[PDB]
Design a protein around this motif. Structure first.
Motif, PDB file in Angstrom:
ATOM      1  N   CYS A   5     -43.699 -31.347 -58.536  1.00 20.79           N
ATOM      2  CA  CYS A   5     -44.923 -30.790 -58.004  1.00 20.79           C
ATOM      3  C   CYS A   5     -45.421 -29.685 -58.925  1.00 20.79           C
ATOM      4  O   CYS A   5     -44.667 -28.782 -59.292  1.00 20.79           O
ATOM      5  N   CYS A   8     -45.957 -26.129 -56.849  1.00 21.39           N
ATOM      6  CA  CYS A   8     -44.742 -25.506 -56.335  1.00 21.39           C
ATOM      7  C   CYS A   8     -43.616 -25.602 -57.359  1.00 21.39           C
ATOM      8  O   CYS A   8     -43.501 -26.595 -58.080  1.00 21.39           O
ATOM      9  N   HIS A  21     -42.516 -32.714 -48.610  1.00 20.34           N
ATOM     10  CA  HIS A  21     -43.243 -31.983 -49.646  1.00 20.34           C
ATOM     11  C   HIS A  21     -44.461 -32.774 -50.126  1.00 20.34           C
ATOM     12  O   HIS A  21     -45.578 -32.251 -50.173  1.00 20.34           O
ATOM     13  N   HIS A  25     -48.694 -32.405 -48.993  1.00 27.89           N
ATOM     14  CA  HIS A  25     -49.710 -32.288 -50.032  1.00 27.89           C
ATOM     15  C   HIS A  25     -50.808 -33.326 -49.821  1.00 27.89           C
ATOM     16  O   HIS A  25     -51.898 -33.212 -50.379  1.00 27.89           O
TER      17      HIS A  25
HETATM   18 ZN   LIG Z   1     -45.902 -28.821 -53.750  1.00 25.53          ZN
END
Ligand SMILES: [Zn+2]
Length: 29
Positions: A5, A8, A21, A25
């Motif tokens: 990602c 992050c 996760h 998104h």
């Molecule tokens: Zn992320």
């Protein structure tokens, strides 16, 4: 491990948490 990602940096196991996760998104959750 080809995907990360961009927004992050925090790290964890890619089994369960990664599903959430990537999902949070796509859908704000
Ligand atoms: Zn992320």
């Amino acid at each position: 491990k080809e995907h990360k990602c961009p927004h992050c940096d925090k790290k964890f196991n890619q089994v369960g948490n990664l599903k959430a996760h990537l999902k949070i998104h796509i859908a704000d959750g």
